[PDB]
Amino acid sequence: VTKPEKFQSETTALQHDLPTLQALTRFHAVIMRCGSYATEILTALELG
């Protein structure tokens, strides 16, 4: 929501669309597949 650049570098406004929903699904799936390091991956994507 705050930095939609970290979602995609072309977006700049997180949309209500079906591709944004599908990419949200795959993002959440990758983060939940990270498991024990999921918060570390998230806060490392918070920074660069």
Binding site: I31, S36, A38, T39
Partner: protein, 48 residues
């Protein structure tokens, strides 16, 4: 064979194993409560 059935038996490929599903609990960190400005009242210490 004479009937068209093959002499050499077929290859049996191994099916894929069922994967183990993973979840995670990502965590947040909001700021703490900061102290407001203190006002002096009119009553004494046990009353206040």
């Amino acid at each position: 064979t004479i009937d068209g059935q093959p002499l050499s038996l077929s290859l049996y490929a191994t099916p894929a194993d069922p994967s183990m599903l993973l979840s995670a609990a990502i965590t947040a960190s909001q700021g703490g409560g900061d102290l407001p400005h203190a006002v002096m009242p009119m009553y004494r210490f046990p009353v206040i």
